[PDB]
Write a protein that binds this DNA or RNA. Structure first.
Ligand code: MG
Ligand code: MG
Ligand code: MG
Ligand code: MG
Ligand code: MG
Ligand code: MG
Ligand code: MG
Ligand code: MG
Ligand code: MG
Ligand code: MG
Ligand code: MG
Ligand code: MG
Lengths: 187, 258, 142, 57
RNA sequence: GAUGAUUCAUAAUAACUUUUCGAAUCGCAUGGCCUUGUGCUGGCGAUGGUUCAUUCAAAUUUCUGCCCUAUCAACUUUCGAUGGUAGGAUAGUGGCCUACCAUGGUUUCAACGGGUAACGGGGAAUAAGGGUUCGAUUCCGGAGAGGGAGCCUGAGAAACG
RNA sequence: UGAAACUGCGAAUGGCUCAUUAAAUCAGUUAUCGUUUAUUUGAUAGUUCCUUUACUACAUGGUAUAACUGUGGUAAUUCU
């Protein structure tokens, strides 16, 4: 079908190769996943040596990591806002790796309350001791906390959904957030 | 093409088996085992062509299925089981014990050993790493994995393996003045003490080696097997003791005894 | 060397995370390694800001296999040059030799600056592109 | 045509050759699994009900 | 701890999983100790099973090396040609494919085209020395199953009993 | 003891031929720190009573379905 070989291309000198061999199976290629959003639907692919591979079609939630905070929560995905390879993936809401998405951000604000006791945006003694002891770490950044006021965080997909089935990511932070923010707010 | 090969034509078999070019199109293809199929000896060619205890492969199978032969203490009723370097072979009828060591001509010898010596074997460590849950292991040259080894054991050393348990009795390090066995290459079968080793970062460390008649040679580090200190070896060496007399001295020695 | 951030994606080294909470000197974590075989890692790799995924020093490639030497005859690609290895081929009938040559496309890191006429030594890596399998490890002529 | 009829409770089965084609014409335009009454096809089969389970053309 | 060299082996933390595996299996022998219940306990195997190593392999890959022809001098590049960045797909690397970008890449040291009554090699015949001609064919590698293309099963096939 | 049938392995090896193929195959020499690997051989799994006082079977839980038995179709097939 889709072949993954180099014998069908021209040489570096530019000559046309002759057909040495029929298409072998160990050099095959398969159609893309084009993972949409909503109503999770994972198919299986049997691959070389047994060794199952999970095509996610139409994934709904994901596990997203806050790297400066060292946690990760299972959060719902709102939609893709940027893709460095293609704008039609942003339009059609496809989820690949390196896609800039919006996520729900409510588990992160629940963890931030339960861990630090200050609310983002705008009772027991043990919790008071814990929240006082980890003080001067409850001042995260301006950009992320303004997103927390708006209830949608910017994340980047670090997983490959067509291969593992999962759509994992990390929250955008720092200079990478500023770069993609200039990309997004660019007219 | 299309998958693994299962046959082995004669004239493609390793030359040190000494299989004659007539009497059949095929040779006994060694099955997958502890040794590479080139540097191995199947039990069919050891029992039939070296010990003459059988006349057919059918008789070798008849010997094997009554569990007579056992190799490294395990029974192994397989016709083409690869017996390799330093394997012990026990024939309990006749109470015989062999070790596969090379003669200096480069072929496997019929080296009869005693019953105390059949209780162990030497192995050259091929890699030391940390397995799962941080447990270290070594891998010997016949693929035995031994967990919790001594921390001083690095690669290219020899460890003495117990063969009732899989435990390590002692070990010989790698430096100058060590008695080595050459297993591989042109100098296959020779025994000499190591004089020095050449670093050669990027591939194929060489080692210089001189026998008891002060003849030097050099070999890749892949083909060297340390067997002890100079004087005592840790095993019994075969007849000849790895000396490599030239053909002139060899016909002179043959005209002595003739 | 006028911007780092030219592409549509964010160029960064993978799994090298700079914590936004802390504030120190030594502005960013930069991963670098020594490529081995006695090749010195250049200071422009250690102190620079370029990203260069296929670099033998800061990037994710490893040098193993042949080490070759050629002369640069082309620099017109981006981060890629073509070297020319000249050799003599012996013909046994006439008992003499003839001049031959091959062109090798090699990858060049932004730690190194080559022009046409420089002699370079290159190290073999995994396939970088359709033709490139070698990577510049030392530029030592002009 | 012919009717390969099985009583599965008692475990017996018997074939019956049927003629007078406008008595089998009640069977037409019907599916496998759909049920038909007996008194259409035959006065020996009075009161009965059959399920169409298959056949060979 | 290792390597010339790793973001390596391995360990840890936080979660993930549509939730993988973690023995409802078989044969001989039938002991041991008891408050004696068909009590507790126990041998040698067989088959299966996660992961690592090993072996048999595979797939890519570096360097150099091929017959005649210039009455073949320019070839490649919208339909990938040479490279860059991201993705996708793959067992994995890679224009392998896609999106965007740059204008490269080969060539008189013979590219590209054409021809081969061309599968390649170990090798064969004939030779003072140097050579010339052949190698479909006992071994090694490749390819094919009337011609093309597509796929199922499986560790392994683009399989032709 | 042993037909059938289910299950498990094997049928990708072997044998044949030389059409295609001119940096292709191939040969010697490298690499995987760039990967799959049935089998073999050696190691290797006290954690699962998934809401964790029984909601139960762990001195052992549920369905099929083949061969078989019987009724048949087609000129014909390793059809069913
Ligand atoms: Mg065999
Ligand atoms: Mg890529
Ligand atoms: Mg690219
Ligand atoms: Mg031809
Ligand atoms: Mg012909
Ligand atoms: Mg052949
Ligand atoms: Mg074929
Ligand atoms: Mg024909
Ligand atoms: Mg076919
Ligand atoms: Mg046929
Ligand atoms: Mg074959
Ligand atoms: Mg095992």
């Amino acid at each position: 079908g889709i072949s993954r070989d180099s014998r069908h291309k021209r040489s570096a000198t530019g000559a046309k190769r002759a057909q040495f061999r029929k298409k072998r199976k160990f050099e095959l290629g398969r159609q893309p996943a084009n993972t949409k959003i909503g109503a999770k639907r994972i198919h299986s692919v049997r691959t070389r040596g047994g060794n199952k591979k999970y095509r996610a079609l139409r994934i709904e939630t994901g596990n997203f990591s806050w790297a400066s905070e060292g946690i990760s929560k299972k959060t719902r995905i709102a939609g893709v806002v940027y893709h460095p390879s293609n704008n039609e993936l942003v339009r059609t809401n496809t989820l690949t790796k390196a896609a800039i998405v919006q996520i729900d951000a409510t588990p992160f604000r629940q963890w931030f309350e339960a861990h630090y006791g200050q609310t983002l945006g705008k009772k027991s003694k043990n919790a008071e001791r814990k929240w006082a002891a980890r003080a001067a770490s409850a001042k995260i950044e301006s950009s992320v906390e303004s997103q927390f006021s708006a209830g949608r965080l910017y994340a980047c997909i670090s997983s490959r959904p067509g291969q593992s089935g999962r759509c994992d990511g990390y929250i955008l932070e720092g200079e990478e957030l500023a770069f993609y923010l200039r990309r997004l707010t660019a007219k | 093409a299309r998958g693994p090969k299962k046959h082995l034509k004669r004239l493609a078999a390793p030359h040190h088996w000494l299989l004659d070019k007539l009497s059949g199109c095929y040779a006994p293809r060694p099955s997958a085992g502890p040794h590479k199929l080139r540097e191995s000896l199947p039990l069919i060619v050891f029992l039939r062509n070296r010990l003459k205890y059988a006349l057919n492969g059918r008789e070798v199978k008849a010997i094997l299925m009554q569990r007579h032969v056992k190799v490294d203490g395990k029974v192994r009723t397989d016709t083409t089981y690869p017996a390799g370097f330093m394997d012990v072979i026990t024939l309990d009828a006749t109470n015989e014990n062999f070790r596969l060591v090379y003669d200096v001509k480069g072929r496997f010898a019929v080296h009869r050993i005693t019953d105390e010596e059949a209780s162990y074997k030497l192995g050259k460590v091929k890699k030391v790493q940390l397995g799962k849950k941080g447990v270290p292991y070594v891998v010997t040259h016949d693929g035995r994995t031994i967990r919790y080894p001594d921390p001083n054991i690095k690669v290219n050393d020899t460890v003495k393996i117990d063969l009732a348990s899989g435990k390590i009795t002692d070990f010989i390090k790698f430096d100058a003045g060590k008695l080595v066995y050459v297993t591989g290459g042109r100098n296959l079968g020779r025994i000499g003490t190591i004089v020095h080793k050449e670093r050669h970062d990027g591939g194929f460390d060489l080692v210089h080696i001189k026998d008891s008649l002060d003849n030097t040679f050099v070999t890749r580090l892949n083909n060297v097997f340390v067997i002890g200190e100079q004087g005592k070896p840790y095993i019994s060496l075969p007849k000849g003791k790895g000396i490599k007399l030239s053909i002139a001295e060899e016909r002179d020695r043959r005209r002595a005894q003739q | 060397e006028l911007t780092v951030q030219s592409e549509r994606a964010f160029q960064k080294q993978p799994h090298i995370f700079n914590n936004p909470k802390v504030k120190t000197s030594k502005r960013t974590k930069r991963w670098y390694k020594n490529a081995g075989l006695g090749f010195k890692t250049p200071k422009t790799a250690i102190e620079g800001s370029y990203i260069d995924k296929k670099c033998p020093f800061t990037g994710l490639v490893s040098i193993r296999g042949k080490i070759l030497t050629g002369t640069v005859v082309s620099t017109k690609m981006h981060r890629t040059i073509v070297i020319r290895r000249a050799y003599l081929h012996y013909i046994p009938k006439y008992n003499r030799y003839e001049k031959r040559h091959k062109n090798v496309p090699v990858h060049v890191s932004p730690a190194f600056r080559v022009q046409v006429g420089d002699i370079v030594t290159v190290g073999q890596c995994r396939p970088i592109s359709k033709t490139v399998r070698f990577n510049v490890v030392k530029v030592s002529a002009a | 045509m012919k009717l390969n009829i099985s009583y599965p409770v008692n475990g017996s089965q018997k074939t019956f050759e049927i003629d007078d084609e406008h008595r089998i014409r009640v069977f037409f335009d019907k599916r496998i699994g759909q049920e038909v009454d007996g008194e259409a096809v035959g006065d020996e089969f009075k009161g009965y009900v059959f399920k169409i389970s298959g056949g060979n053309d």
